Structure formats: structure tokens, C-alpha cells
Amino acid sequence: IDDDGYRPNVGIVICNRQGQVMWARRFGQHSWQFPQGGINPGESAEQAMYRELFEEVGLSRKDVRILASTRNWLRYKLPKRLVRWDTKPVCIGQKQKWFLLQLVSGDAEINMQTSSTPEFDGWRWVSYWYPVRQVVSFKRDVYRRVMAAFASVVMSLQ
Ligand SMILES: Nc1nc2c(ncn2[C@@H]2O[C@H](COP(=O)(O)OP(=O)(O)OP(=O)(O)O)[C@@H](O)[C@H]2O)c(=O)[nH]1
């Protein structure tokens, strides 16, 4: 369904009650992003979200509240140099649903090492638009729309 070259994907914005969001550092790199990942066949976006929430951040439902979610896809294109044309299903980009999670269990529960090959090796609380300012350029349009979609809810926690 909707085989359009864009891989179904779900991203996570974790917030606290001070208008900050959790920013994660890609393993062995100095680039940062929100947790994201593919939605597997048969999974709802919410189910994929909770799976990657634990795989990438070590958090489960008891640690968070889903405050909001986006209903429609936000799409971004890979840089042409990064497209893998011989690996099916070929994707030229990702189409993302996004979830807004309040962390309610405390910072110590974040655990990015639930695997021997972790996605991330560090995290920071950052100001609300800092992800828009710092994310790789080809995700910036999506990040703007995600953060704006979630802004009123995040502010309501302060
Ligand atoms: N230099 C640089 N490259 C990035 C950055 N983020 C993603 N990339 C590269 O862009 C390509 C696409 O990245 P993503 O769209 O995040 O997809 P992915 O990480 O391969 O797959 P998922 O984590 O499952 O969503 C990957 O090959 C990354 O190496 C970044 O912040 N800096």
C-alpha cells in the first residue's frame, strides 16, 4: 500500500515539564537526532514507537505518557548519494509519524545500552528549537513541523 519510495518510520520527542526535549548522540559520532526507526510490517506506528523507545532509549510505558501524536506523514528525502538502489525495498526517503512522550520516571531510567550495538551513546536535555537548529539539514523541514505540532502541548506542562 502506497509504495511511493518512502519507508514508513516513527520518531519520538521526549519532553519534561520545563519546555525541554531529549536530544541523543548517534553512536560513535558527534551528530545528534531524535530517536526514530522503521515501522515493521504488521505494526502500528504506536507499536513500532514503543519497540524502538525501549531498544534505543531503554524506556517503557511505565516511564512515559504519550501526550500527542501526528496523524499524517511527514516526508524527507535522503541525499542522492545515500540512496541504495540495489537493496529492496528501495527507498529514496522516509515518511514519518511522530509521538510526543513526557518522561515521568526520572532521568536515571534512560538506558541507551539495551544492546551490544546501541543506536546512541549520549543524551542531553535541550531547549525546544535546538533540534531544529542542529539536525542534519535534510530533516530540518520535518523537525520544524514536528516541533510546531507539539509546541502547545509541551508548553501546557509548564
Ligand atoms: N553526517 C550525518 N549523516 C546523517 C545524519 N543523520 C543521518 N545521516 C545519514 O543519513 C542516512 C539516512 O539516515 P536516516 O534517515 O536517519 O535513516 P537510518 O538511520 O539509516 O534508518 P532509521 O534509523 O531506521 O530511521 C544514513 O545513512 C545516515 O548515515 C547526521 O546527523 N549527520
Swiss-Prot record:
Belongs to the Nudix hydrolase family. RppH subfamily. It is an enzyme of class 3 (hydrolase). Its EC number is 3.6.1.-. Disruption phenotype: Altered 5'-processing of primary pre-tRNA transcripts with short (<5 nucleotides) leaders; in the presence of the truncated inactive allele encoded by rph in strains derived from K12 W1485, including strains MG1655 and W3110. In the presence of wild-type (catalytically active) RNase PH no effect on processing. No effect on growth rate, a slightly stronger effect is seen when combined with the inactive rph allele. Changing E52A: Loss of function. Gene3D superfamilies: Nucleoside Triphosphate Pyrophosphohydrolase. InterPro entries: Nudix_hydrolase, NUDIX_hydrolase-like_dom_sf, NUDIX_hydrolase_CS, NUDIX_hydrolase_dom, RppH. GO terms for molecular function: hydrolase activity, acting on acid anhydrides, in phosphorus-containing anhydrides; magnesium ion binding; mRNA 5'-diphosphatase activity; RNA NAD-cap (NMN-forming) hydrolase activity. A motif (Nudix box) lies at residues 37-58. This is RNA pyrophosphohydrolase. Its cofactor is Mg(2+); Zn(2+); Mn(2+). Residues 5-148 form the Nudix hydrolase domain. Keywords: Hydrolase, Magnesium, Manganese, tRNA processing, Zinc. GO terms for cellular component: cytoplasm. Pfam families: NUDIX (PF00293). Magnesium or zinc. Manganese can be used to a lesser extent. Monomer. No interaction between this protein and catalytically inactive RNase PH was detected by immunoprecipitation. It comes from the Bacteria. Optimum pH is 8.5-9.0. PANTHER family: M7GPPPN-MRNA HYDROLASE (PTHR23114:SF17). GO terms for biological process: mRNA catabolic process; NAD-cap decapping; RNA decapping; RNA destabilization; tRNA processing. Master regulator of 5'-end-dependent mRNA decay. Accelerates the degradation of transcripts by removing pyrophosphate from the 5'-end of triphosphorylated RNA, leading to a more labile monophosphorylated state that can stimulate subsequent ribonuclease cleavage. Preferentially hydrolyzes diadenosine penta-phosphate with ATP as one of the reaction products. Also able to hydrolyze diadenosine hexa- and tetra-phosphate. Has no activity on diadenosine tri-phosphate, ADP-ribose, NADH and UDP-glucose.
